Amino acid sequence: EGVFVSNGTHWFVTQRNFYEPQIITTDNTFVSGNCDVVIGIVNNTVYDPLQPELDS
Amino acid sequence: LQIPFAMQMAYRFNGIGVTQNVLYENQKLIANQFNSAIGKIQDSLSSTA
Numbered sequence: 803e804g805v806f807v808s809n810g811t812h813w814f815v816t817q818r819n820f821y822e823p824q825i826i827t828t829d830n831t832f833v834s835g836n837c838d839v840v841i842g843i844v845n846n847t848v849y850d851p852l853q854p855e856l857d858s
Numbered sequence: 859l860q861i862p863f864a865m866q867m868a869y870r871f872n873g874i875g876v877t878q879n880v881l882y883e884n885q886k887l888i889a890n891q892f893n894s895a896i897g898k899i900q901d902s903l904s905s906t907a
């Protein structure tokens with residue numbers, strides 16, 4: 803529930819009616835299919851909040 | 859506030875309770891069905907008073 807936006811160099815999710823930028827994660831996003839179908843998709847990292855606990 | 863038209867249409871799909879990946883994965887079909895439906899209205903209004 804949001805929109806992806808960039809300040810020109812970095813990518814964030816934000817809520818649609820008020821600018822509040824957040825790190826893109828597995829938790830504020832959902833997967834569907836591969837990158838070959840969607841018109842205008844962009845390459846970026848999506849953060850996984852479990853991985854730091856597995857790095858511990 | 860400007861927004862890209864396919865992203866506006868993706869919000870319209872959330873508003874009817876359809877998950878917005880259904881728009882981006884079918885965007886070319888949805889656009890062709892819209893363009894064809896406007897074409898039928900030209901034909902109706904040309905042919906029939």
Ligand SMILES: *[C@@H]1O[C@H](CO)[C@@H](O)[C@H](O)[C@H]1NC(C)=O
Pocket residue numbers: 841842843
């Ligand atoms: C916008 O249009 C350009 C060409 O003018 C194209 O390269 C790009 O992929 C398009 N981006 C989106 C988000 O549709």
